[PDB]
Amino acid sequence: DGYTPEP
Amino acid sequence: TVDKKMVEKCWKLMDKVVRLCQNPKLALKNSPPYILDLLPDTYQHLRTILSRYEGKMETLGENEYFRVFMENLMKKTKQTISLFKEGKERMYEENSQPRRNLTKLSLIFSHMLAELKGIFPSGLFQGDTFRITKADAAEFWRKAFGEKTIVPWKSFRQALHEVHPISSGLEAMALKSTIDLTCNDYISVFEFDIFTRLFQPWSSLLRNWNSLAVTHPGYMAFLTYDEVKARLQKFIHKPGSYIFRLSCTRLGQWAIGYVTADGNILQTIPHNKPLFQALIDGFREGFYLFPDGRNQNPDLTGLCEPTPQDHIKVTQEQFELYCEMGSTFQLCKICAENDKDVKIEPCGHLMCTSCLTSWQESEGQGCPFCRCEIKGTEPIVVDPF
Amino acid sequence: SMHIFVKTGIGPIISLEVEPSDTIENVKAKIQDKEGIPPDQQRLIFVGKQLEDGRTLSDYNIRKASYLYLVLR
Ligand SMILES: [Ca+2]
Ligand SMILES: [Zn+2]
Ligand SMILES: [Zn+2]
């Protein structure tokens, strides 16, 4: 699963 | 009371639901909640329970939670059976009302399966010893219900109203909708844990819930990864547009979907931090500005107020024991560079936030010392001896 | 020859009968004979320093009654 880190 | 025939009848109904969903005319997506995977998975865990209780069927049969779960399983399976019977052709209509109900029932089976696995891990009953993540939440359940695994809605509502008052029946029914995941008019210790993880801190439980799930236009409740990208496609030319949702695979956790300076539609997970803390952080540096593309963004400053971290005093027994090692209790044992300043919930293991972040960045949400799931975290201070 | 201690979060403190000439792999296998934990999942720590499988106990200055920490995967 490909999410994203916190901006 | 759960006997041999009742369980066998449930499985025969479960098989009929599988046969109905196996129809290639429905062309349903493999993505969770996938009922064709959920129901066979529910059959195996129940079979695992029965093999752990072979001979001891009097203990399992008279078990309150198991009676309720089985009663709800037959009801939810029969509801699906009737759903296919009433409006047969509407089952193939992509976004029709009966089709949206199948997606809703699939979500329920997913919550029901996660609940069964949480209450009966490895097939043995552990509901009475279920570890509630947040401390203040755990103390509420113990003082009000003790070691009870499941309690009726009206009994849960009257206990909660004593600590966190409920404004109206409208609020109570909305509160019931979010916490009752299995839709059986009972609240379990597992369901309670999920609500108290999402709407932390406990001290302002209903205020956080009202500001994030009732009055917030960004709240989308349960939504699949694809649906978040599908809803945010309308606001591609509006940088700062965002939405926050729940995941059936990651119960008790939040997920945010937003549009960047270029677009692309990115999705992040705050991980064990209160949602308003990430939303406030996200607003002050122009990332989360438009909830569901709306110009007006709610001010959540009232919820986030700098609070002191919980203090832990090291005992004489611990000091003496650490002295033999040539170290201290408070020193983080992973890096041995900093003192322990974070507690893993519910295992209780401590380390420095630095080692935790690095472990979570590469390995995931599992405790370095006991492999237990990181359901939550809490910043702490260890007062030396 | 000597005894070292291995602190875990899965049970009581592990006491191991070892020699300085023993590799980190040998120590991991000795923990496997005690808790059944696969060595490829074990990560040993000595005063915040991760122990490498190829190296030996004497290389890290791990002497008698030294305390090692066990981290999993
Ligand atoms: Ca329920
Ligand atoms: Zn550390
Ligand atoms: Zn732990």
Numbering used by the authors:
A (entry chain B): 5 to 11
B (entry chain A): 50 to 434
C (entry chain E): 0 to 72
Verbatim from the authors:
We report the development of three ubiquitin variants (UbVs), each binding selectively to the RING or U-box domain of a distinct E3 ligase: monomeric UBE4B, phosphorylated active CBL, or dimeric XIAP. With ∼600 members, the RING/U-box E3s form the largest family. This family uses a RING or U-box domain to recruit E2 enzymes thioesterified with Ub (E2∼Ub) and facilitates transfer of Ub directly to substrate. RING/U-box domains promote Ub transfer by shifting the equilibrium of E2∼Ub into a closed conformation (Dou et al., 2012b, Plechanovová et al., 2012, Pruneda et al., 2012).
The main difference between the two structures of pCBL47–435 is a shift of the RING domain in relation to the TKBD caused by binding of UbV.pCBL. UbV.pCBL resembles Ub, as the two superpose with an RMSD of 0.76 Å, but substitutions in region 3 of the UbV mediate interactions with pTyr371; Tyr66 and Tyr68, replacing Thr66 and His68 in Ub, form a hydrophobic cap around Met374 at the C terminus of the linker helix and Tyr68 interacts with the phosphate moiety of pTyr371. UbV.pCBL also stacks against the second Zn2+-binding site on the RING domain via a hydrophobic patch formed by substitutions in positions 8–12. To validate these interactions, we measured binding of UbV.pCBL to pCBLR variants containing an M374R or an I383R substitution, which are expected to perturb UbV interactions with the linker or the second Zn2+-binding site, respectively. Binding was reduced in both cases, with a KD of 1.6 μM for the M374R substituted variant and no detectable binding for the I383R substituted variant. Correspondingly, UbV.pCBL bound pCBLR tightly in SPR (KD = 120 nM) but did not bind detectably to CBLR.
